[PDB]
Structures are given as C-alpha cells and as structure tokens.
XYZ file of C-alpha atoms in Angstrom:
103
model
C -9.902 -18.105 32.672
C -6.960 -20.171 32.338
C -9.444 -22.553 30.575
C -11.107 -20.089 28.378
C -7.599 -19.289 27.481
C -6.427 -22.505 26.198
C -10.065 -23.037 24.409
C -9.388 -19.370 22.871
C -6.011 -21.126 21.389
C -7.037 -24.392 20.574
C -8.804 -22.548 17.919
C -5.904 -21.952 16.250
C -6.042 -17.577 17.749
C -2.873 -16.008 17.686
C -2.233 -13.950 20.619
C -1.068 -10.536 21.314
C 0.713 -8.293 22.853
C 0.628 -4.654 23.667
C 2.802 -5.579 19.755
C -2.216 -6.838 9.517
C -4.739 -7.613 7.174
C -8.267 -8.590 7.930
C -8.949 -10.166 11.707
C -10.455 -9.363 14.372
C -9.031 -8.908 18.135
C -10.739 -10.166 21.326
C -10.242 -8.708 24.903
C -10.839 -10.466 27.208
C -12.007 -9.396 31.244
C -11.280 -11.626 34.238
C -14.089 -14.772 33.957
C -15.580 -13.604 37.094
C -17.806 -11.967 35.490
C -16.416 -15.747 28.027
C -19.252 -16.105 25.910
C -17.439 -13.342 23.219
C -15.746 -16.428 21.164
C -18.732 -18.138 20.355
C -20.925 -15.017 19.304
C -17.686 -13.337 17.214
C -16.784 -16.852 15.616
C -20.923 -16.456 14.405
C -20.282 -12.969 13.112
C -17.522 -13.569 11.006
C -19.454 -16.819 9.782
C -21.863 -13.948 8.929
C -19.273 -11.906 6.840
C -17.482 -14.195 4.355
C -16.092 -11.168 2.606
C -13.321 -11.258 4.427
C -11.192 -14.214 5.471
C -11.190 -12.773 8.867
C -8.576 -13.815 10.815
C -8.267 -13.826 14.927
C -6.117 -12.768 17.434
C -6.832 -12.720 21.523
C -5.134 -10.825 24.584
C -4.280 -12.616 27.434
C -5.890 -10.262 31.358
C -2.757 -8.084 30.891
C -2.999 -7.277 27.499
C -6.306 -6.938 27.681
C -6.409 -4.081 30.086
C -3.456 -2.607 28.097
C -4.906 -2.586 24.636
C -7.562 -1.146 25.590
C -7.118 2.411 26.507
C -5.641 2.756 23.413
C -8.688 2.088 21.462
C -10.393 3.808 24.172
C -12.059 0.683 25.352
C -13.569 1.220 28.877
C -16.221 -2.008 28.930
C -15.502 -5.194 28.314
C -15.650 -8.276 26.625
C -14.755 -6.285 23.368
C -13.956 -6.479 20.213
C -11.196 -4.877 17.518
C -12.776 -4.991 14.176
C -9.572 -4.228 11.124
C -9.806 -4.353 7.990
C -7.079 -3.674 6.817
C -5.705 -1.446 9.759
C -14.804 -1.506 17.639
C -17.185 -3.589 19.661
C -17.675 -3.510 22.912
C -19.357 -4.433 26.044
C -22.202 -6.704 26.718
C -24.747 -6.878 23.298
C -27.321 -9.429 22.365
C -26.988 -11.411 18.980
C -29.161 -8.334 17.416
C -27.479 -5.936 18.718
C -23.819 -7.165 18.386
C -24.676 -8.012 14.471
C -26.088 -4.182 13.566
C -22.966 -2.686 15.640
C -20.581 -5.310 12.860
C -23.015 -4.805 10.180
C -21.915 -0.197 10.616
C -18.555 -1.332 10.801
C -17.963 -3.057 8.022
C -20.030 -0.627 5.963
C-alpha cells in the first residue's frame, strides 16, 4: 500500500481525511487483495465534460469514508459532480455504471 499511496500522490491527486465541485474520490483497501487508479484515469478521460478533480483516502480514512456513503466493497469510487462506484468490475461494467451516474 505504501507504494500505491505514493503513486497516487505522485499523480497530484489530493488526500482527504474524513473531512467541492467536479471531482471523484478513490477509496482503497489493503493491496494484499490497486488497479483502480488506471481504470478511473481512463474513465475520466472518456468523460471530457467535467474538469474532474481527484482525491484519495489512505487505509483508515477509506474505512471511515465508506460507511458514510454505505460503501461495503472496495475498491470504491465516489462521484461528485457538484456535491458511487463500488467493488470490482470489468472495464465494460465500470463504464456503464459511470455512464448511469452521469446521466
């Protein structure tokens, strides 16, 4: 997770504790079970409409930021357009889910 965390920050994505505009939040679970970034990166790319911002939560703050949004499965991603994807999904599935949230 240490390597993953640094890779997410090296992307410029901002960290958020249990504390907006057009942005998405990535919640992580212990890597010993990490591919969510690239896919999300791809998703946003396929949706040029918003100037999506991205924020990430470490292991603890992902626990907290999850119940609040009733997220029981990880990796998960919260979509805010101006103020939720959860679990593992093949590229195809993910897109339809994000396509539903947007429209």
